[PDB]
């Protein structure tokens, strides 16, 4: 606890526009009910991971 | 029939490399059994056409 650094909740700075955003293979299990149906799926195996 | 231009069967010249290649919506019907299973499918509707 450092009273000169009380921690809180915020957001950060921006980029040049080219971005869809992925995930990895670890905590899919509790953490899966935020977004909604917002994908550009391809269920045909041409990809791999 | 122009005997100075007898027609035959050949191929053409090349480009810089960025190319997968699509199709349209017209003669899918007789013409569908050349290639094989060579796609990077996405059966999830995120695309549209």
Short mmCIF file of C-alpha atoms in Angstrom, two decimals:
data_model
loop_
_atom_site.label_atom_id
_atom_site.label_comp_id
_atom_site.label_asym_id
_atom_site.label_seq_id
_atom_site.Cartn_x
_atom_site.Cartn_y
_atom_site.Cartn_z
CA UNK A 1 0.00 0.00 0.00
CA UNK A 2 1.74 3.12 -1.12
CA UNK A 3 -0.48 6.09 -0.38
CA UNK A 4 1.14 8.06 -3.14
CA UNK A 5 0.17 5.28 -5.57
CA UNK A 6 -3.45 4.34 -4.86
CA UNK A 7 -4.47 1.92 -7.59
CA UNK A 8 -7.66 2.29 -9.67
CA UNK A 9 -9.26 1.47 -13.03
CA UNK A 10 -8.49 3.14 -16.39
CA UNK A 11 -7.82 2.82 -20.16
CA UNK A 12 -4.88 3.65 -22.54
CA UNK A 13 -3.80 5.35 -25.84
CA UNK A 14 -4.42 4.61 -29.51
CA UNK A 15 -2.83 3.33 -32.80
CA UNK A 16 -3.18 3.31 -36.68
CA UNK A 17 -6.20 1.34 -37.78
CA UNK A 18 -5.70 -2.33 -38.62
CA UNK A 19 -6.98 -4.62 -35.89
CA UNK A 20 -9.09 -7.70 -35.28
CA UNK A 21 -8.15 -9.39 -32.02
CA UNK A 22 -7.59 -12.97 -31.02
CA UNK A 23 -6.97 -15.14 -27.97
CA UNK A 24 -4.82 -18.01 -26.69
CA UNK A 25 -5.33 -21.45 -25.17
CA UNK A 26 -5.26 -20.99 -21.39
CA UNK A 27 -8.27 -19.56 -19.51
CA UNK A 28 -11.07 -20.07 -22.05
CA UNK A 29 -12.96 -21.81 -19.30
CA UNK A 30 -14.24 -19.24 -16.78
CA UNK A 31 -13.78 -16.43 -19.19
CA UNK A 32 -16.07 -16.67 -22.21
CA UNK A 33 -19.31 -14.68 -21.78
CA UNK A 34 -18.51 -10.98 -22.44
CA UNK A 35 -18.64 -10.20 -26.13
CA UNK A 36 -21.46 -11.77 -28.10
CA UNK A 37 -21.66 -13.07 -31.67
CA UNK A 38 -19.05 -10.74 -33.23
CA UNK A 39 -16.73 -12.92 -35.37
CA UNK A 40 -15.76 -13.38 -39.04
CA UNK A 41 -15.71 -17.17 -38.66
CA UNK A 42 -14.40 -19.67 -41.11
CA UNK A 43 -15.32 -23.18 -40.09
CA UNK A 44 -13.38 -24.82 -42.88
CA UNK A 45 -10.04 -26.19 -41.68
CA UNK A 46 -7.89 -24.10 -44.08
CA UNK A 47 -6.33 -22.19 -41.11
CA UNK A 48 -4.90 -24.49 -38.39
CA UNK A 49 -4.80 -22.78 -34.98
CA UNK B 1 -10.34 -19.14 -90.63
CA UNK B 2 -7.32 -16.99 -91.17
CA UNK B 3 -4.41 -19.18 -92.15
CA UNK B 4 -1.98 -16.64 -90.80
CA UNK B 5 -3.73 -16.90 -87.42
CA UNK B 6 -4.28 -20.58 -86.67
CA UNK B 7 -5.61 -20.77 -83.12
CA UNK B 8 -4.16 -23.08 -80.44
CA UNK B 9 -3.70 -23.52 -76.68
CA UNK B 10 -1.24 -21.61 -74.45
CA UNK B 11 -0.53 -19.75 -71.16
CA UNK B 12 0.51 -16.16 -70.17
CA UNK B 13 2.93 -13.97 -68.08
CA UNK B 14 3.41 -13.38 -64.37
CA UNK B 15 2.94 -10.86 -61.47
CA UNK B 16 4.12 -9.92 -57.88
CA UNK B 17 3.04 -12.50 -55.35
CA UNK B 18 -0.24 -11.93 -53.54
CA UNK B 19 -3.01 -14.14 -54.86
CA UNK B 20 -5.78 -16.48 -53.77
CA UNK B 21 -8.49 -16.75 -56.41
CA UNK B 22 -12.24 -16.72 -56.29
CA UNK B 23 -15.28 -17.24 -58.50
CA UNK B 24 -18.70 -15.77 -59.34
CA UNK B 25 -22.31 -16.93 -59.43
CA UNK B 26 -23.01 -18.08 -62.98
CA UNK B 27 -21.76 -21.47 -64.25
CA UNK B 28 -21.06 -23.29 -60.98
CA UNK B 29 -23.23 -26.07 -62.31
CA UNK B 30 -21.36 -27.98 -65.04
CA UNK B 31 -18.07 -26.62 -63.93
CA UNK B 32 -17.06 -27.79 -60.47
CA UNK B 33 -14.81 -30.90 -60.55
CA UNK B 34 -11.25 -29.75 -61.42
CA UNK B 35 -9.40 -28.62 -58.33
CA UNK B 36 -9.88 -30.70 -55.20
CA UNK B 37 -10.01 -29.79 -51.52
CA UNK B 38 -7.75 -26.69 -51.65
CA UNK B 39 -9.52 -23.91 -49.71
CA UNK B 40 -9.02 -21.81 -46.55
CA UNK B 41 -12.71 -22.06 -45.66
CA UNK B 42 -14.54 -20.15 -43.03
CA UNK B 43 -18.02 -21.52 -42.52
CA UNK B 44 -19.03 -18.86 -40.05
CA UNK B 45 -21.19 -16.16 -41.66
CA UNK B 46 -18.83 -13.24 -40.83
CA UNK B 47 -18.14 -12.66 -44.58
CA UNK B 48 -21.33 -12.32 -46.69
CA UNK B 49 -20.75 -13.26 -50.35
#
